[PDB]
Write a protein that binds this ligand. Structure first.
Ligand code: HEM
Ligand code: TDZ
Ligand code: PLM
Length: 464
């Protein structure tokens, strides 16, 4: 007995009842008719949707174990093969994530903290923006390089030089597989697999890129193997290799060259375009909101000064900027529908039974936009994370990284990259818009699984 829901048409479920261009709007509308929990069918597939804090929490958190399964999909399986962390489940998942989480702690991979890799990058970033000579530009590409390089310096050792050819194709490929796989069409194709045949070129293009990336990562892992100094790991690959060596006698062990290549790939996928997007969105919101960028730069000046690059320890003494980064994430609403889950076994939810394997969808956006927890949930306002005395006010409704057992495996890095990149930038540049601010649109183009900020141009004017 699944939760209530629209009546499905025998073969295509409720597909033609939901706008694939903005399926979140469709879901919100269904909740107005069926309530917090409801079932909809994408083709033959039943998807139970959780909408609102009470429901999302009850599911993701209170029943975390049952809801910690990754929502399967033909396209994910063909590419990842159940390998790595993003698309794995059960034991293999539990083990890889557990290892990943620890080797991604600030000092979980050697003498060089992750924070220091981010700072080196935040630095190279401003020196690039510096090169645009205050002229108007589309930050998209340049902003996307930073997050990509962070991941590079987290898994491969040192960062790449922005001009490095290897770095640029390794990036244009992820950016390519991203622009393709984030199309509403993939959602359709995932439920009606036959449709993939209607896209031979695109199909080949993806697998082609997945080939080149994987084989490249594999080249790197051999490099890391030849130079492996077990006493002091340089990066994610050294740590994983070290771990392999230990489980060596075990042929059950998930830690093998297979999961390694996948997990590194997963890291690029899971941490590049997301961060990049929130970054662009963030700069855009700061551009549109001059009064906010000002207090941030005032806080930066008052705590960090003009003779020292910001660091994570400062965030503790910068409640406003903290509220700003949280509001940026709360407004960006990067993944409105959250990433699909799947219950691990027959699961009881209130007066409903959800059969093992059923696909779950916890509407993060419904949390992030709770009109009671965040009055005027649709306006960008740091006050949403600020108390009467200007102190940061954490919220339970802050779920942009999801929640429960499967919450973003890189929340820390994500938040770190956002705080260091944004501050390091505002400390060195002022944001000027090409046109009149009123003409500046900040409404997201919520097509596909990841929302994107509208396109825009910006001038980075170095400060004096
Ligand atoms: C501002 C940027 C980012 C946001 C908003 C974000 C958020 C998310 C979300 C919503 C999920 C899905 C959670 C779920 O299963 O319900 C996720 C998963 C994941 N994220 Fe991120 N992410 C970002 C950056 C990062 C970064 C920088 C890394 C890299 C270390 C990363 C690594 C992962 C991984 C590995 C998973 C899969 C975890 C699993 O399946 O157990 N993320 N993230
Ligand atoms: C590069 C990139 C991709 C391709 C991306 C997403 C992000 C955030 C990315 O940075 C979000 C999900 C989605 C838009 C669609 O769902 C998928 C998520 C991950 C994957 C992993 C595949 S894509 C790739 O180049 N290598 C992989 O292992 C496939 C599909 O894919
Ligand atoms: C194993 C990988 C399989 C990948 C299959 C991808 C199938 C969906 C391809 C969708 C392509 C959409 C192209 C048009 C995009 C647009 O113009 O908006």
């Amino acid at each position: 007995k699944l939760p209530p829901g629209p009546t499905p048409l025998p073969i295509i479920g409720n597909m033609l009842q939901i706008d694939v261009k903005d399926i979140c709007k469709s879901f919100t509308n269904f909740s107005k008719v069926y309530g917090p929990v409801f079932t909809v069918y994408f083709g033959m597939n039943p998807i139970v949707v959780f909408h609102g804090y009470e429901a999302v929490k009850e599911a993701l958190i209170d029943n975390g174990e049952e809801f910690s399964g990754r929502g399967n999909s033909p396209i994910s399986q063909r590419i990842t093969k159940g390998l790595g962390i993003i698309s794995s489940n059960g034991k293999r998942w539990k083990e890889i994530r557990r290892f990943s989480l620890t080797t991604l702690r600030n000092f979980g991979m050697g003498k060089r903290s992750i924070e220091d890799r981010v700072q080196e990058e935040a630095h190279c970033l401003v020196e690039e923006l510096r090169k645009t000579k205050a002229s108007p530009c589309d930050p998209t590409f340049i902003l996307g390089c930073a997050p990509c390089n962070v991941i590079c310096s987290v898994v491969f050792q040192k960062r790449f030089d922005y001009k490095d050819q290897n770095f640029l194709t390794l990036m244009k490929r992820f950016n390519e597989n991203f622009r393709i796989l984030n199309s509403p069409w993939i959602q359709v194709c995932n439920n009606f697999p036959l449709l993939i045949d209607c896209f031979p070129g695109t199909h080949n293009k993806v697998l082609k890129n997945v080939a080149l990336t994987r084989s490249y990562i594999r080249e790197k892992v051999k490099e890391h193997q030849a130079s492996l100094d077990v006493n002091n790991p340089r990066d994610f690959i050294d740590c994983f290799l070290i771990k392999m060596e230990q489980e060596k006698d075990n042929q059950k062990s998930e830690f093998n060259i297979e999961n390694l290549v996948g997990t590194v790939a997963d890291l690029f996928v899971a941490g590049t375009e997301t961060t990049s997007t929130t970054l662009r969105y963030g700069l855009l919101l700061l551009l549109k909101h001059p009064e906010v960028t000002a207090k941030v730069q005032e806080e930066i000046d008052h705590v960090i000064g003009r003779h020292r690059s910001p660091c994570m320890q400062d965030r503790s003494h910068m409640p406003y900027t903290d509220a700003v980064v949280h509001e940026i994430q709360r407004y960006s609403d990067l993944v409105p529908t959250g990433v699909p889950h799947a219950v691990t076994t027959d699961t009881k939810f209130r007066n409903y039974l959800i059969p093992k394997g059923t696909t779950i969808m916890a509407l993060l956006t419904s949390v992030l936009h709770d009109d009671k927890e965040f009055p005027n949930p649709n306006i960008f306002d740091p006050g949403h994370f600020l108390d009467k005395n200007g102190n940061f006010k954490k919220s339970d409704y802050f779920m942009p990284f999801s929640a429960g057992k499967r919450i973003c495996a890189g929340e820390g890095l994500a938040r770190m990259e956002l705080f260091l990149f944004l501050t390091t930038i505002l400390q060195n540049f002022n944001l000027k818009s090409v046109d009149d601010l009123k003409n500046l649109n900040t409404t997201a183009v919520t097509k596909g699984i990841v929302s994107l900020p509208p396109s825009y141009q910006i001038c980075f004017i170095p400060v004096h």
